[PDB]
Amino acid sequence: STGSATTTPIDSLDDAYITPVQIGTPAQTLNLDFDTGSSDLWVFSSETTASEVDGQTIYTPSKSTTAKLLSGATWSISYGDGSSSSGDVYTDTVSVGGLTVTGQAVESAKKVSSSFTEDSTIDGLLGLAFSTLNTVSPTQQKTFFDNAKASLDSPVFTADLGYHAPGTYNFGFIDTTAYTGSITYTAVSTKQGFWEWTSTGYAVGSGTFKSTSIDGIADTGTTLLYLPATVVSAYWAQVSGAKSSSSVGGYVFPCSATLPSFTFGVGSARIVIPGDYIDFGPISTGSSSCFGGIQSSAGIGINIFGDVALKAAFVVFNGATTPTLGFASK
């Protein structure tokens, strides 16, 4: 089997991407944030505290003839941005782009933190990291990809995120028309539960490539590119007037600037992030100070190849017995 679904930016900055997902019988379609940095599929629901719902579409398990309470199971998750959610668990039928999994754990939110409430466009998350990170207790549950894997034509999914435009998540096949050149594959460590890999270096604009190993994660659920302070300083030093602002929370730059590109290495191959992808616009409405799309990871504990980096590539998440990541230009 295969599946193919369009993913759409939630706003004009590409802060996140939503993909329609069918849950239950008859189908209830929710727009979920596919997140290769986490491993829970959770949704706003008829159980979510009413004051914490503000415009989201909710899953109502009582209206699904295939929903079943997973007795005794609870979940609770906290994300790197400080947001969180928790609740109980149903199993139900879940379909993405024509690919159907029966018995998928659908984690129903009883509580969500303010940032979820305040984002009316995201109805939940669909985790695509390794199932060892799933938070369901006392019986850990499998991701949608893990459950579908055996049925797929090939045990892979791909992320093809657009810049200011829709893109595609494919399951079970590699669309050879969706990228240019060849796909370069690189080793993955699953020891932390992430799609963790080592980039071979970087370049700033037209500068020379610096060969240096950068361990980090491919994370579709993180907006920006978080890299070591040395790398980030070298990038922003090429932008007149850019500075790190403790009050804003990272590097800012004059909105009048033209940003240089940023290149990262994948083995001997190179992925070029155009300068425009690094512009996240005014820090506040009407400001001439703009927020940078490349930020320091020094306070995180891990480097994160988020959407800024991934949307410059066609990315293969290869879930074979020994997982690997593939990157191509497009």
What is the rounded distance in angstroms from the CA atom of residue 13 to the CA atom of residue 329? 21
Beta bridge partners of 108: 43, 88
Residue showing tokens 């669909």: 126
Neighbours of 38 (CB within 10 A): 25
Question: What radius of gyration, in Å, describes the C-alpha atoms of the chain?
Answer: 20
Query: Is 199 one of the annotated active-site residues of the chain?
Result: yes
The CATH number of 5-174 is 2.40.70.10
Alpha-carbon torsion (149, 29, 311, 127), positive or negative: negative
What is the third-level CATH fold of 175-330? Cathepsin D, subunit A; domain 1 (2.40.70)
Query: Is 35 one of the annotated active-site residues of the chain?
Result: yes
- Peptide-bond breaks in the chain following residues (C–N over 2.5 A): none
Identify whether the C-beta of residue 90 lies closer than 8 Å to the C-beta of residue 70. Answer: yes
Give the H/E segment covering residue 217.
strand 210-218
Q: In angstroms, how far is CA 274 from the centroid of its own chain?
A: 19
* Nearest CA among 247, 214, 210 for reference residue 229: 214
Q: In angstroms, how far is CA 184 from the centroid of its own chain?
A: 20
Q: Which of 199, 261, 296, 297 is catalytic?
A: 199
Extents of the domains making up the chain = 5-174, 175-330
Whether 5-174 shares its CATH topology with 175-330 is answered: yes
Give the H/E segment covering residue 146.
helix 144-148
Helices (H), 33-139: 114-117
Q: Which of 35, 88, 92, 307 is catalytic?
A: 35
Q: What is the four-CA torsion angle of 94, 129, 135, 121, rounded to 10 degrees?
A: -60
What is the rounded distance in angstroms from the CA atom of residue 243 to the CA atom of residue 250? 8
What is the rounded distance in angstroms from the CA atom of residue 59 to the CA atom of residue 163? 30
Give the resolution in Å: 1.1
